[PDB]
Structures are given as C-alpha cells and as structure tokens.
C-alpha cells in the first residue's frame, strides 16, 4: 500500500552466557508496524541468525521525511527473484520522499519485470546530491536547462453521467 519508513531495533533475549547482547538497527519500508516487525525478523534471521522466538523488539518508530516539499533524485539498489534466478538492479526516481520513491519502485518493478513485494529486497536508497550522479536517460531529460513542454491531445474531462453531449468536444484543453 502506501508505505511509511520505520527504524526497528532488535536484540537477542539476554541469557546467562550473554548478559548483554548486541543491538541490531534496520530501516524498513512497510504499510504498518505489524509488517515492519515481520520484515525485521525476516531480514535478521538470514543476516544475524536471530529468531523472533529468541529475541525481542527494542523499538519500532516512524522516520518522517525532513523536507517533503523539495524535489530530489533517488537511486535505489535492490535484489529480486525472477522466474529463473536472482538479479541485482539499480534504478533512479524523482520524488519528494524516500517512501514515495519506494512506492514508485514497487509499482515500477511489478509493471516492467512482473515482480512482487514478496520477491524484492530494498538494499539501499540514497539521494543524489548533484546531477552528474544521475546515470539513467529517463531521469537526465527531466533536469535539463529550462524544461517546458506542451500537453497535446489532452481529452477534456466530462461527467460520466452526462451520457449525451450536444456538440463534439475539442481536445485542446
């Protein structure tokens, strides 16, 4: 759905052999905190051998975008499982927040490569500080000198309950 970004800190339950265990922080993009904790244990199981039964969630709180009103460029590294293997990819998006870029990727990756949320791992999301960091053609064309384009065709908006119209609409809106 619409994703928030959570930081989730976990830990193995302290035992007699390990009175003070290590803390594991992780940033997760999830629709809600229930999924965010579920994603945390899924990633931590493969990474640090820690399981939910033998662990506890220290904290899980939302990180909100600092400047949601500044247009910035994002570069995302992921790995996904196709129907015949696993592949790493790099994509670039132009959004307002890291969450907005991630929602774009999940729709983009489903539209183009038919991948699903259960198949994609978000390795890293960064903000491109400058324009020479952009390495893709579809993003370089939106940061040109003075971007200005018309809107050809552009059929008008007519109420779907207004079944009949007296005159033929003009597509010059």
């Amino acid at each position: 759905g619409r994703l928030q970004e959570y930081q989730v800190i976990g830990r193995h339950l302290p035992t007699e052999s390990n009175p003070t265990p290590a803390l594991y922080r992780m940033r997760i993009f999830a629709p809600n905190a229930v999924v965010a904790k579920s994603r945390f244990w899924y990633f931590l199981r493969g990474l640090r051998k820690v399981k939910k039964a033998t662990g506890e969630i220290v904290t899980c709180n939302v990180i909100t975008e600092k400047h949601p009103l500044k247009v910035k460029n994002f570069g995302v590294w992921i790995r996904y499982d196709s129907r015949s293997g696993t592949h790493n990819m790099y994509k670039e998006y132009r959004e307002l927040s890291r969450t907005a870029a991630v929602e774009a990727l999940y729709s983009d990756m489903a539209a183009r490569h038919r991948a699903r949320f259960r198949s994609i791992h978000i390795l890293k999301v960064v903000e491109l500080e400058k324009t020479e960091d952009i390495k893709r053609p579809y993003l370089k064309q939106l940061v040109t000198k003075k971007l200005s384009f018309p809107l050809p065709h552009r059929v008008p908006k007519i109420s779907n309950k207004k079944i009949f119209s007296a005159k033929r609409p003009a597509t010059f809106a």
Binding site: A33, V34, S38, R118
Partner: protein, 49 residues
C-alpha cells in the same frame, strides 16, 4: 480473570461494516485478516460491534 472471563458468554459479533478486504483468509501481514493484528483489532471491533 479466569472466573470473570468464563462467566461472560462468548461475544456474538456481527459482520464488519465496510470490511473486510479483497482476500480475507490470509495473514494480516500479507494483506489478509488471519493472525495477529497487534493493536489494530480495535478498528475491527468497532466495525463488528
């Protein structure tokens, strides 16, 4: 709590108003309803009560 809980007949709720969602018999984590919706059971209770 054991005597107080057992004294209460099981609550006979109605179907939620608005709910549930497209696929109901999946875990709440993967877009369903089954399982542990931790603090979200209150929103469900309002619909079903």
């Amino acid at each position: 709590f054991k005597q107080a809980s057992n004294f209460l007949w099981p609550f006979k709720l109605s179907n939620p108003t608005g709910g549930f969602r497209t696929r109901k018999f999946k875990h709440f984590i993967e877009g369903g309803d089954l399982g542990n919706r931790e603090e979200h059971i209150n929103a469900l209770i309002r619909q079903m009560n």
